[PDB]
Amino acid sequence: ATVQQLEGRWRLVDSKGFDEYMKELGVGIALRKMGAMAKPDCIITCDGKNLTIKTESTLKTTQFSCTLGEKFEETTADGRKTQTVCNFTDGALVQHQEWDGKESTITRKLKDGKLVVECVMNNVTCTRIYEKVE
Numbered sequence: 001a002t003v004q005q006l007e008g009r010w011r012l013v014d015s016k017g018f019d020e021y022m023k024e025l026g027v028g029i030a031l032r033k034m035g036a037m038a039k040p041d042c043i044i045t046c047d048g049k050n051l052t053i054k055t056e057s058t059l060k061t062t063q064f065s066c067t068l069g070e071k072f073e074e075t076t077a078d079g080r081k082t083q084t085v086c087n088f089t090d091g092a093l094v095q096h097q098e099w100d101g102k103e104s105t106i107t108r109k110l111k112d113g114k115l116v117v118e119c120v121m122n123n124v125t126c127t128r129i130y131e132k133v134e
């Protein structure tokens with residue numbers, strides 16, 4: 001696999017465990033209902049070693065730019081300010097977040113032309129499936 005196979009615009013088609021994952025991140029019931037309603041686009045750009053992931057929704061647009069392997073300051077959709085590191089390892093893009101003694105791991109890989117986003121926090125797992133637009 002390659003990091004450049006994840007590149008492009010992707011559109012959400014399936015979601016499993018998003019509510020529980022948001023509950024675990026400390027998200028309020030009101031924001032959880034909104035977040036569950038949204039059907040975002042995920043725009044991935046990869047300059048071989050530089051990475052940008054934009055999440056477009058009519059509700060909220062989020063984005064981060066990093067250099068693979070380097071720890072940067074990331075502001076999340078739910079307003080957490082995290083120290084994040086992104087790494088492309090074993091045919092998957094791994095994003096590890098750290099804030100106020102807590103940790104989360106977002107893994108993005110390709111599976112039958114579809115972008116599979118596995119979000120994990122403690123015992124909680126979420127699976128978001130995206131389909132390519134461009």
Ligand SMILES: O=C(O)c1ccccc1NC(=O)N1CCc2ccccc21
Pocket residue numbers: 034035036038039040055056057059060061062077106117119128
């Ligand atoms: O949605 C995702 O697959 C996603 C996966 C992993 C980490 C964060 C995510 N979500 C995200 O960054 N945003 C921004 C705007 C918005 C609206 C509604 C639901 C979510 C989001």
